[PDB]
Amino acid sequence: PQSSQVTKRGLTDPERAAIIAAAVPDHALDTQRKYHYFIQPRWKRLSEYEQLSCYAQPNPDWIAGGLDWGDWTQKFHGGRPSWGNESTELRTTDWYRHRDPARRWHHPYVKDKSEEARYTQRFLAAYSSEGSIRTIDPYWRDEILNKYFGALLYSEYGLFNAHSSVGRDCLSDTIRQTAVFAALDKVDNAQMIQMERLFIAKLVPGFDASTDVPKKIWTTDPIYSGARATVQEIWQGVQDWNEILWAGHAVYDATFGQFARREFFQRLATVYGDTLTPFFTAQSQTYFQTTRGAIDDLFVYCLANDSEFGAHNRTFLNAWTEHYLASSVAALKDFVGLYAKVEKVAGATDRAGVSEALQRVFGDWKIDYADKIGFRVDVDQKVDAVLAGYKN
Amino acid sequence: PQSSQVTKRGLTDPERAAIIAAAVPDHALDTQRKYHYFIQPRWKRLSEYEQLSCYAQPNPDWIAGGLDWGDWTQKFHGGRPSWGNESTELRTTDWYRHRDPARRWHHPYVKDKSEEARYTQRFLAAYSSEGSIRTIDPYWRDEILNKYFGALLYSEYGLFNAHSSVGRDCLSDTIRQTAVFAALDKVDNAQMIQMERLFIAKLVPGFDASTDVPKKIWTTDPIYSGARATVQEIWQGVQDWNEILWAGHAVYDATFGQFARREFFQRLATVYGDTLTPFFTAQSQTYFQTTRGAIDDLFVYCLANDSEFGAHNRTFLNAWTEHYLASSVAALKDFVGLYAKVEKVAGATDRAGVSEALQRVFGDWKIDYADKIGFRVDVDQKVDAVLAGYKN
Amino acid sequence: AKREPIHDNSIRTEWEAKIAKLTSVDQATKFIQDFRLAYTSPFRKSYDIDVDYQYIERKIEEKLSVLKTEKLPVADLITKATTGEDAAAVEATWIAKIKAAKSKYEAERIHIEFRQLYKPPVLPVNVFLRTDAALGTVLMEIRNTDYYGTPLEGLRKERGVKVLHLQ
Amino acid sequence: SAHNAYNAGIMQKTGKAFADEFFAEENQVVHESNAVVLVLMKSDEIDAIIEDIVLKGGKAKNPSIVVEDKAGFWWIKADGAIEIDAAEAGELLGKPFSVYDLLINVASAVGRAYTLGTKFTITSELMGLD
Amino acid sequence: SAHNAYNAGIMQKTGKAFADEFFAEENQVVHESNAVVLVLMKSDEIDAIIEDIVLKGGKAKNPSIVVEDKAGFWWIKADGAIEIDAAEAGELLGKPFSVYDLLINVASAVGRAYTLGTKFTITSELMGLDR
Amino acid sequence: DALKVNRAPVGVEPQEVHKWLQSFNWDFKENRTKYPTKYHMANETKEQFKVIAKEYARMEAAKDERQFGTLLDGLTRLGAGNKVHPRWGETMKVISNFLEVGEYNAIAASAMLWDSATAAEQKNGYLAQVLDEIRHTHQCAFINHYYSKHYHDPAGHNDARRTRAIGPLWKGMKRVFADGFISGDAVECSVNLQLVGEACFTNPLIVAVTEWASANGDEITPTVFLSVETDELRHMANGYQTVVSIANDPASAKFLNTDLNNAFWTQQKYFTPVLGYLFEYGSKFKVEPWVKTWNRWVYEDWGGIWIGRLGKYGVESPASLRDAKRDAYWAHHDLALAAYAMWPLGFARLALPDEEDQAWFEANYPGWADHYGKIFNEWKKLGYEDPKSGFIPYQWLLANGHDVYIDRVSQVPFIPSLAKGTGSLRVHEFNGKKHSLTDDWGERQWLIEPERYECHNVFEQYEGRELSEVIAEGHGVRSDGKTLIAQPHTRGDNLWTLEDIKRAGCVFPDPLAKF
C-alpha cells in the first residue's frame, strides 16, 4: 500500500476512458495540423528541424523578425534588455532567417555524436588489440604529436569558451542552436585530443599523457604565441557575438585551425606511419565542415546578402576579416616554426611542401569565405608572409 | 466506413478492458520471471544475449547439449539429419557452450554497424569538402591502392561466402550468430573497399573505380595467386563448418588477411600521404578483432580445451592449421612481390621493413592461436619463407 | 485614448519619414540621442509614443548604422563614437562617474543616462557592452546593500512617486 | 471498389451460406487475381502516408484502392499495383526519409514487391514472365 | 516509513483542518528536513531496480525509505540518503548498464545528487559545508 | 619497440579524460566573465558528473530513442493522441508552450553561468546544461508538434509561438522562468534558475504534471516530460557547487539572502497561481489539491531539504514565504476568475467547473462555493458558453467594480475586490506614467529598480480597441479565419467566432485612469 492515491490512467481505466471518449468530439475542430505552419520554409517543404526550432525565442517587434510586442518584463540593472540590437554591430531584416543546412535540432545532433562516441571506443579496443601503434615513427609520436598536437587542444578549448557569450547574446533560435552545437564540437576536439594522448599512454610505456607539457607549450612556446593571443581576443576581448562567431570559425579556425589540424597533424601522420591520429582528425575535420556549413549560412546567405543590410554587414565583416586574418597570418607564421623540429619529407615538410599547404589553406579560404563577402586577398602574398617564419 | 470490423483494442476499450481486468488474477501464478533461468551463465550473472540466443536451436539429446529428444521430423533424401554430428570432425560435450565475448545478439550488432554506416557518410561528405585527397601520393593512389586494394575485396568476398554452409550446418545458436555476424563483416569489407574506390573516383578525374582491373588482378596476377587458391579451398573445397571457421578466420585471415590489410594497405597508406584509406581499414580491423574474440572462444575455450575432446579437437586443428598455414605462407610469398611495385620507403618497404612486418603477423599469430592449440611454429622460418618471394 | 494597431500605425509611419530625411552621421546621432533622452527609460520626457518608441528606436538605429558604414572610415567604426569622442575615453569617463556616486539614486541615473546617450550604434558595440557591464556591476552592489532597510513608505518618498492609491 | 474489400464476396456470408460457397466445386482451385495486398504498420510516418498519399494521389490514379483499419496495421488492397514514393513521404514529414526508411513500417506485400529508385511499388505484374 | 510518506503530516488533513495547520504560525518558515526525495521514471529497467534494489537491499540498509506509485514515475523518499549502484543494476538486467545509462530514467532529485564511480547517491549531507 | 607492445584491449573511459579537463584552462589577464555580477568569490569547484562531449551525446540520444519510439511507434499505433480529455488537451497548449520559453531562456541563463564560471569543469558542466535546455525546448515543441497531428484540436497547439502574444497570461510567463533568469546578475542564476527554479519549481511543473496528464488520458506528456527532468539533477548539481562557494565567502554571503527571497517571490508570484489554475481548472480528474502539491514539493521538501538544510550556513528562510503560502491556497482561484473572464485573449478552450468539480473545490477549499463558485455559476447562467449571448465576463467585472489590474513587475493579473490571495493595489505616478503594484516584494523591486520593469501591459497596448480587433490582428483564429482558437467550452459545436465576440462590444479601458 501507499499513503497517497494510486491515480488511474485515463488511457486504460475503463471508467475514465469512457468519460474521456464521451467528452472528445467525433470531429476535429481544425484541419491545420502542420506545427507552426506559418514558418517561412527555406527549402522545398517545411522541415521538422524548422518546426521545432523557429520562433522559439520570444522576440518582440523591435527585434527584427519578432512576432511579439512590448518591452521585456524584466531587464538588467541600468536597463539592458533581455535581448537587444545593442548586442551586435550587424543588422538584418529578420534574425530568424538562419537555417543550419544540416538541419540539426538537438536529437539529430546527439544521435550523430553518440554514434561517434560508441564507435570510437570500439575502434580503440580493436586498435590496441591490433598493436598497430608499433609502426608509428617514435620521434613524431613523442616529440611532435604528444607535445604539439596536445598543445592544440587549448586552441580548441578557447574556441569553445568563446561561445559562452554568443549562447547568451545571439538573437534567434537557429543561430543559438548553431553556436552551441559548434561549441560542443570544439570542446569535443579538445577532449578527443586528450583522449588520444591517454590512449597512446596505455600502449607506450614512458609516454606521458599529462597536460603539463602541452599547456607549457600552448602558453610559453613561441610556436603557439600567435594562436594563443588570437583566441584570447576572440574569446575574452570582444562581446559582439557575430564578431565572435565570424572571427572564430570563418577566419582563425578556417585558416590556422585548418592548417594545424589538417595540413600538419593529419597530413604528416600519413607520412610518418601514424595509423591512429587520422581517426581523431577525421572527427575534428568532419565537425569543421558541418560547422562551416552553418557559419556560412549565417554570415553569407543571411547577413552579407541581406536585402537591406548586406553591404552594411560586409563593411563590418571586411574590417573583422582584415584584423583577424592578420592575426591568423601571425599565428601561422609562428606555427610553421614547428617544421624545424619535424623529420624532413619531400613535398610535405620542405619549403615547397609547406608552400603548397599554405596555398591550399588560403586558396580554399578565398573560395569558401573571402569571395563571399567581397574581401579581396592575395593568396601568394599571404603564403609568402607565413613562409617568412619557415626555416630552411 | 469499411467492410470488415473495426476491432476494439482490449488495452483501451472500456468494456473489454474491464472484462480483461476481471479475468486477470490479483496475484502472480509464479515468481520465476528470469527468461530461461536454467541457462548456465558464462559470467557472473545471466545476460540478455544468452537469454535471447541460447537453446533457440531445438537440438535433441543425441546432439551434445540438446534438451529435446527423438529424431527429426523430416530429413534429407538418404537420411541426413536436419542437424547432425556428421557435419564436423570436431567433438564436444556441449555445442551450446560457445559465448561471443562481445555478447552480440541481433540488435546490438546492427546498432553498432548502423553507427558506422551513418558516420561513414558524414565523414565522406566532409572529407570530399576538405579536399584532403590532394596530398595523397598519386602513384600509390592510382597504381597500388586502386588496383590491388580493390583486388583484395575478392579475398574478403570469398571469406564471406565460405560461411554459406557454416550458417546452415553448425550445431548451436551462439555459433550460428557468430558465423553470420562474421560473414556480414566480410562482405562489408568487400563493399567498403569498393565504396572507397567509388569515392576516390568522384574526387579524381580519370580514376577508374570499375572492378574490371581488380578482378583481372585477383584472378590472373601472381601476387594474389596463392591467396585466391586458398580462399577457393576454404570456401568451396570443404564442408566441415568448424574447419571453415578455423581455416578462414584463425589461419588465413589472421595471417594473410592481417598482413595485406594492416601491414600493407593501412600501414603504407600512412607513409604515402593517404589520409582516406585509414578510415576504411579502421573498420575492417575492428571487425577482425571483434570476430577474433568470438572465434577464439569457439576453438580455444570450447573446443581445444573441451574436458573430453580437447586433445581430440587439437589433433584436427593441428592438421588443419599445418595445411592452411602453408597455404597462407604461399599466399604471403606471392603477395610480397607487390613491394617490387611500390615506392621505396626505409623501414617499411625495404627487406628489413617487410621482415619486421612478417614478424608482427606471425609473432602475434603464434600468441593468439598457435600457442593456444599446441601448434609449434618457427616464426623465423615462416618469415624467411615469405621473404623468398621478395625482390631486393 | 484609443491606440492604433500594434505593428502598423500612423505614429510609426510618421516617425519613419523623419528618419528617412537623415543624411549624415552627426545628424542621426543628434536625432538618436535626443530621441532616447525624450522617450526611453523611467526618466524619459514623454510617454506619448510609449507603445511605439522601441520599434522607432530600432529604425533610428538602422539609419545611423548604415550612414556609419557609408560615411565613416573603418577605424572610426571600431575606436570612436559617432559624437567624435574616443570610445575608450567614453568608457573610462562614465565608469569613474558611477563609482563616485554617493547613493544608489545617483548611480542609477548615471547608468541610465549613459545608455540613453551611448547605446549603439553611436558607441561601438564591444566597448558599450563592456562599459554597460561595469556600470551595472557598481549599480547592483550599491542597490543590494540593505535592500530591505528602507521601509516601503520611506522608499516611496525617496523615489519621488505621487502615491495615487494605497489599498 | 467492392471486390477489393477485406470482407468482400464470400466473406460477407455467415453460417451455412458461408460454408455452401466455401465448399463449392468451382472454389476448390485458385482463381487468378490481378490484385495486390499491401500491409502498412501503423506509425506516425505511415498514418501520414495513408491519409495524404495513397488515399489522396494514390486513389486518384488507382480508384480501386481499399484501405481498411486493422487495429495495429493498415490493410491496403488494389488492382494492378500500389505505389508509395519515399521522396513524397519525406516532403510530407519534413525529415530525411529514404526508400529504406519507408520500409521500416511496410510489412506484408502480397504481390511482386520491388523498389525503383526512391519509389516503392508492389505490382501484380509477373516480372521476368510478362 | 510514516514521516517519509507523500501524504504524511498535514497532508492527511483536508478542508478546514488542512488550512488551519497550513496557515499556522509555526509553519510560516521552512523546517530543516534530513530527508531526500528521488524520482524514478518508470521503465523496464527502473521497475527492476525498484523491486530488487531499493525495496530489497536499499530498504534493509535504510528502513525509512518510502516508495509511492505516481502513475508515470516512482516517488522515493528516505532519511539521510538514497543509493543506487549501476553495476548492481547491470547484473540484474543482464545488459551493459553504466552509471550514465542509469541516469536515463532518474528524474527529480530533491537533495545533493552526485555519482561516485558506478553508484548514484542523493544525500542530505551539505558537501563543502558539512564534514 | 617496433615488435613488442601490449595488445590488451583498452579504450579511454569518460572519467579518464574528465580528470584533465581542469587543466585545459590557462591564465591570462582577460580571462574573466563578461556579464555584471556582485559575486567575485573563488569558484574553482568540481562537477559531480564526469560528463564529456561524447558521453553527453550518448546518454541523451539513448533517452530520445526510447521517448521517440514510444511516441512515433507505440502511442501513435494506440491512437493515444486523441485519448486525452478535452480539458487537458487544451491545458497542454499552455503548459508545454509556456515551459518551452522557460526552457529556451534556460539555454541563455545557463550560458551566463557558463560564461561567469571560472573552473573549466563548471564551464564544461554548464555547456552540457546549455545543450540540455535546447533538448527541453525541442521536447516541449515536440509535444505540441505531436498534439497538432493527433489531437482533435490542433489550433493552439500549432501556432502558440505567435498566438500567445495576444493574452495577458503569457506576459507574466516571460518573467517567471525567462527574463527573471537572463536579465540580472550572471552568477546569481545559480540562485534564481537553479536553487529556486530547477531545485524547487521544476518538480511540480515538469514531474507532478505527468500524473495529472495520465489521469486525464495523456500519456504523451509523461513520455516527454519525465525524460526532461532526468537532466535536472545534473543542472542543480552545478548550481549547488556555486551556492557553496557563495556561502563560504562572507563578502558574497551578504547578498545571498536578498537574492534568494527576491528570486523565490519572482518565480512563485506566477508559478503558484498560474499552474494551480491550470492543474485544477484545466483538468477533469484531479490528482490532489494544488495547495497540497505546493506544500509537498515547495514548502516541505524543497524548503526543508534545500533551504532548511542550508539554514545552518546563513541561508535564511525566504521572508516572503508566509505571503507565498497564502498564494498557494487562494491565488490560483483568483487567477481562474481573470483567466475565464478574459478567455478570448488566450489560445486554449476552457471549461467551467461542473457540479462534481465545484464539490471538489469547496471540499478541499472551504468557502470556494460562496465566492468563486457563485461567480462561475452566474456567468454560466448569463451565457458564458453560448456564442449567441453576447456575454464576456470582463465587461461584467467592470460593471460591478471588479477591475483587473496588471502588476508592473510580475505582470500577474490582480482583482483586489475579488482576490483572496496575497495582494493589495498600490498605484503610483512617476514622471507622468501610472504604475500598479500588488505586493510588498514586487513594489520594492520597482521602487528600487524602475528601469528594469518598464513592461507594457495588455491594457496600455489595446487601450480603446475592441476585443475582436486585437484577436484578429494577433492571428487568434483557426484556419477559416473567423472561428476563435480560444473557447469558453470544450465541446465540438457552437464555437465562438469574431462576430460573436464583436457583438459583446468589449473595449479595453485604462484601469489606472480612475486614479
Next chain:
Amino acid sequence: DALKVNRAPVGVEPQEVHKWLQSFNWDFKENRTKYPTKYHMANETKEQFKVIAKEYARMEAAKDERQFGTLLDG
C-alpha cells in the same frame, strides 16, 4: 593535382556499391553449391532491393529502437 580538386560535398549511396556486387564473384571449377538439388538452371538474377551491409544495419537498427522504445519505456 595537389592544389585544385573538386570539394563538392559528396558521399556514395548504397545503390552505388550495389551495382558492382555482381562483379564480386569470379569463375572457378569448384564454384558450385554444396547441397543436393534437382535444379541446375541458370539463376543469374538481380535482387529487387539495393541492400548493402551498412544500409541493412541502418534500417534494421532504426526498426529496433522504435520497437524497444515502445516496449521498454512506453
